[PDB]
Amino acid sequence: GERVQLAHHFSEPEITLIIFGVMAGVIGTILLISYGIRRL
Amino acid sequence: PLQQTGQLFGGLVRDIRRRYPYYLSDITDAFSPQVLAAVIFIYFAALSPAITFGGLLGEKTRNQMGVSELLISTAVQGILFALLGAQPLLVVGFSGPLLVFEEAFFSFCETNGLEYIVGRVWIGFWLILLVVLVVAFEGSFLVRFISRYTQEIFSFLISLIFIYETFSKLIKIFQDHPLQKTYNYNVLMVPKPQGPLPNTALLSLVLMAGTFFFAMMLRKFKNSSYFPGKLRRVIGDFGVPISILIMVLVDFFIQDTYTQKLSVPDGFKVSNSSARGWVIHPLGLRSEFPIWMMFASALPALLVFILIFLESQITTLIVSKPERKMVKGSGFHLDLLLVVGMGGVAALFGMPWLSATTVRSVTHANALTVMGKAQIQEVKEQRISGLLVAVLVGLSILMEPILSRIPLAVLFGIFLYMGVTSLSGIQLFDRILLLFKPPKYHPDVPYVKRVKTWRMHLFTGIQIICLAVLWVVKSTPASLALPFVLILTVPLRRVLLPLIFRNVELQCLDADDAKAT
Amino acid sequence: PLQQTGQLFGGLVRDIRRRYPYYLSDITDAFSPQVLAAVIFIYFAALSPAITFGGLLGEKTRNQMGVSELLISTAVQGILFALLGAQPLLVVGFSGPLLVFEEAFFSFCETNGLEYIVGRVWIGFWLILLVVLVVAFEGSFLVRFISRYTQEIFSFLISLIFIYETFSKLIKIFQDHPLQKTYNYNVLMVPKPQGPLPNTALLSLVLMAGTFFFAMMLRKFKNSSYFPGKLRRVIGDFGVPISILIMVLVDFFIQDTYTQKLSVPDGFKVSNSSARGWVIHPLGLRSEFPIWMMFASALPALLVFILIFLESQITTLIVSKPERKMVKGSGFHLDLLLVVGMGGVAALFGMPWLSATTVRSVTHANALTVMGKAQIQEVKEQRISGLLVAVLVGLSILMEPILSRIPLAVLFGIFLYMGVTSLSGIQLFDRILLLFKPPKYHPDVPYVKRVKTWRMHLFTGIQIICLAVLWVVKSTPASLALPFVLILTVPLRRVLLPLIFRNVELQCLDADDAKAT
Numbered sequence A: 001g002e003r004v005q006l007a008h009h010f011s012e013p014e015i016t017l018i019i020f021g022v023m024a025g026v027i028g029t030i031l032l033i034s035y036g037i038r039r040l
Numbered sequence B, C: 001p002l003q004q005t006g007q008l009f010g011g012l013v014r015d016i017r018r019r020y021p022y023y024l025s026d027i028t029d030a031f032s033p034q035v036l037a038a039v040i041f042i043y044f045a046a047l048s049p050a051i052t053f054g055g056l057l058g059e060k061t062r063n064q065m066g067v068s069e070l071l072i073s074t075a076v077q078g079i080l081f082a083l084l085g086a087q088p089l090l091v092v093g094f095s096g097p098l099l100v101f102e103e104a105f106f107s108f109c110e111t112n113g114l115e116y117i118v119g120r121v122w123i124g125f126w127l128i129l130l131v132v133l134v135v136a137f138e139g140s141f142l143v144r145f146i147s148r149y150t151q152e153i154f155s156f157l158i159s160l161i162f163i164y165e166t167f168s169k170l171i172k173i174f175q176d177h178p179l180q181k182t183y184n185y186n187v188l189m190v191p192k193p194q195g196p197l198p199n200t201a202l203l204s205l206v207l208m209a210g211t212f213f214f215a216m217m218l219r220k221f222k223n224s225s226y227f228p229g230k231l232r233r234v235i236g237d238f239g240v241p242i243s244i245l246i247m248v249l250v251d252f253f254i255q256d257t258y259t260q261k262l263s264v265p266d267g268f269k270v271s272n273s274s275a276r277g278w279v280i281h282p283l284g285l286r287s288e289f290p291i292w293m294m295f296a297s298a299l300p301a302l303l304v305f306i307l308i309f310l311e312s313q314i315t316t317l318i319v320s321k322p323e324r325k326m327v328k329g330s331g332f333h334l335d336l337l338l339v340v341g342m343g344g345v346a347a348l349f350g351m352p353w354l355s356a357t358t359v360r361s362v363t364h365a366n367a368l369t370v371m372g373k374a375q376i377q378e379v380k381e382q383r384i385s386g387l388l389v390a391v392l393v394g395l396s397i398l399m400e401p402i403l404s405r406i407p408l409a410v411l412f413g414i415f416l417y418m419g420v421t422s423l424s425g426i427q428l429f430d431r432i433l434l435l436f437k438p439p440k441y442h443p444d445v446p447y448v449k450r451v452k453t454w455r456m457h458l459f460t461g462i463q464i465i466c467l468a469v470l471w472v473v474k475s476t477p478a479s480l481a482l483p484f485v486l487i488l489t490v491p492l493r494r495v496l497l498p499l500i501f502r503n504v505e506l507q508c509l510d511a512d513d514a515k516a517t
């Protein structure tokens, strides 16, 4: 970044990949739940 | 296009198959000087509000986000929206409610001692979550309940706000340089003049008035019967560029009198190099970002999604009315998905999110319209114009000497022209003019020949109350509730209006395609 | 009306028998607000030229004739003409050619050491002899040889002169107060500013633009379809007074900026009391008047008679065309006699001779012109308007506090409105517009459908050559030969034109009643 930034365990690509993976998992869970409804 | 298929991502897939077959036509249809004239129009029409909003954002956020970030975000979003969106006539850019939300969120973060840009990153992260569910479940099908009533009320209110801000900038300029009997000839000018100057505000007013006059005269000359028809159409299409060039030359031939000019950042760099870089860490830059605020960002994310969704869908409805001869189709699910996703991604780069602005997209649709031998004949639907506008916005930093000699007064006259020409397609403004006309001079339309004059006046005055209420909300700190008050008009149309009006009267006054019931 | 009776003073009594029976109608027809609006219009439209020409005449003749003398002469001649003339719609006052003759005669008297005012008295004495003989022998029967050709050429030339001088006054205002980076805050204001002043020229331009814009807007609102018809037409008739009031209030609310105002004499006194009095002795004031100059004044008397005769008679032709719905009659013989006699009488009092000016008379006639539901319906032919204008011009000295708060820029916009509305009744102007139109857009008129396009364009181009030559004549020191050059078009129409144009083409293109041959 710029100036002095706090050091984190995960770098920016790593943390954004983790966040995108969590978001994709939540979206997939919601879609699968909706697929479960309206069938039984 | 507004039908609900019931399949996951059903609207997104159909919008792809509706427009992408016309991708070859979306490039070949731009081979005309009218497309270039529209490019020159929309370039300034999107750049000047972008520059103003970037300056205000830098002032109000301590330069965490400024002119350069907004310019880069606007260029990227315009390029990707023109290349991939199903409605290439839309213009995506910053809006007023977005600025109000950013001001409120910056104040909230300052009060709580939290990092503002990381909060924006997390809100944009939750923005991507919201849009995918809406697109998957076809949540963009609710806009079919937004009839001509709400669309025209929103368009009229937005045009009124546009004209009011255009006049307010001139009023502020006049206040900055009041007409005095004596002046101090030794006034510092960098970065802005620190005192009143002679002939400045008056020359700005003259430039604005001349710009508006020349633009209107050339627009009338397009419909006139002078000069050869091909040359007449060519001159009329370039009416705004010709007027802008004329007023720029007029100001350039005047050296002594100072006029405020367009200002852009020197290079492609962040506004505050000591605050943040091009990439902002979601975990915190200076301090560890709190865990609770990551989840608590959903409600501001919900507000931002509501704002963007309403603005973009209403703009797409307005630019794609059946009376405007849109014979290529529009995609509500694809455009919304692209806009919200680009905003969420650009939040990670420290850039503001955007929305399909009403005024700029309405002007872009109207600038591309070709009239018949009074009657709309066809519209030059193509993706080249928006792509070129976004490219020129991105390159506006590199062409500073061209922009550095352009006064804002010319842009003020252009904005007034856009505001007064954005009302052609609104029946609400037409009926407001009928409030000052005798009944025998009313046009032969279904809502006049089948509705009593006092009934039509009452129906028009009902909307005037709604317009006044919306204007009051804008003039209050809680101006972020404006979309909710706008949504409340739909229950008024579907519930309260039938209690006082008949079905035939409602069909005549509010027709989705301007038909005789 | 132009026929020769063959009886001594036959044309004089015939004009007396034509209009004087309608005398009771000439008073009753004026009881309407449109007449009052016309009075308000023509009051400024005749006072401002009177003030400007009086100032110029006093500057060029060392105040031997000045603003007060011109105002008094205007009042007296206007009252006598409105109470006795057979074309009361004519406006009597000073004109440019008369000023040029005054300058030339002052130079001639100064070179030869002659008394200028006594020479004027003798010339005015010779004027009474000339017009009595001409009316007795019906010399006004030669006016029938002036067709639409010469009438339209003279009207177009005079309108071009008026508009060019209106713009040249603005150019002079800009040059006197140029746009500068710095100004001297200590500049003497009495009697006029001695240096450039801030915000002066720009505010004058703003006032002129606003006045012309609002006058045009209210004229358009007269023919629009807004408001109830009675109120709409009342406002449209009072468009000029309302625009004047709005712009006067706008200038009044700006206090710091200096704007040039109307200046009237302090009281009813001669401009130079050290040179002459109210009555000038024809035998000489300071030195004995030479005998030879008493007889040598006949040639300048002939030149002045030609100028006044041609000006007033062509103005009477223009304001009393059959197409203008003047159904009460006009007197060529009586009005010429009255005008020249009043000029000769005013010469004895040291006051300038006057003639019917084209611009003011045509504006006065158009102010009382009633448009049908487009098509000219009727003209409020009445004597009260001219009499009231003369009375108000005479009383302009006593109303100094009101006239001292009116800027010249508002009057400049009024002059621009008069100039652009003076071109309506000219088919030459209409044919000029056809030079920039495709032939299919040309209107369905007899001179287009019966004559080939290039023949009509050549006919228009020949007239423009005459107009350009007359423009050259005006911009040359021999500007007193202008009526002779205008007369030279009468041989052009009746001799040279038939050699290159067919009889049908000449009948269609130059028609006294706009008929199809």
Ligand SMILES: *[C@@H]1O[C@H](CO)[C@@H](O[C@@H]2O[C@H](CO)[C@@H](O)[C@H](O)[C@H]2NC(C)=O)[C@H](O)[C@H]1NC(C)=O
Residues within 6 Å of the ligand: B062, B063, B272, B274, B275
């Ligand atoms: C760039 O950001 C820095 C901080 O990130 C700003 O520095 C702060 O400025 C404010 C305003 O006076 C004050 O709180 C302090 O002077 C600074 N605080 C800290 C913690 O540094 C700086 O002003 C910003 N630059 C611009 C042009 O706004």
Ligand SMILES: *[C@@H]1O[C@H](CO)[C@@H](O[C@@H]2O[C@H](CO)[C@@H](O)[C@H](O)[C@H]2NC(C)=O)[C@H](O)[C@H]1NC(C)=O
Residues within 6 Å of the ligand: C062, C063, C272, C274, C275
């Ligand atoms: C009024 O008239 C007198 C004389 O006609 C003017 O006095 C003359 O002024 C000019 C200008 O300098 C010079 O010829 C002499 O100073 C004067 N000559 C004579 C014969 O007196 C006087 O200037 C006029 N007043 C105004 C205001 O123009």
Ligand SMILES: CC(C)CCC[C@@H](C)[C@H]1CC[C@H]2[C@@H]3CC=C4C[C@@H](O)CC[C@]4(C)[C@H]3CC[C@]12C
Residues within 6 Å of the ligand: A018, A019, A022, A023, B125, B126, B129, B291, B294, B295
């Ligand atoms: C809609 C999108 C933004 C996902 C919703 C956010 C929630 C479910 C997820 C996304 C990323 C997650 C974070 C990822 C990594 C870490 C670091 C760890 O040491 C503590 C938990 C923490 C801080 C997580 C907290 C929960 C979190 C914020």
Ligand SMILES: CC(C)CCC[C@@H](C)[C@H]1CC[C@H]2[C@@H]3CC=C4C[C@@H](O)CC[C@]4(C)[C@H]3CC[C@]12C
Residues within 6 Å of the ligand: C125, C126, C129, C291, C294
């Ligand atoms: C055409 C009009 C002006 C009349 C014609 C003018 C000639 C013919 C007449 C009119 C008045 C006359 C003058 C009247 C009085 C006198 C005084 C006398 O001691 C000498 C002759 C003299 C000076 C006359 C000369 C001739 C004269 C100038």
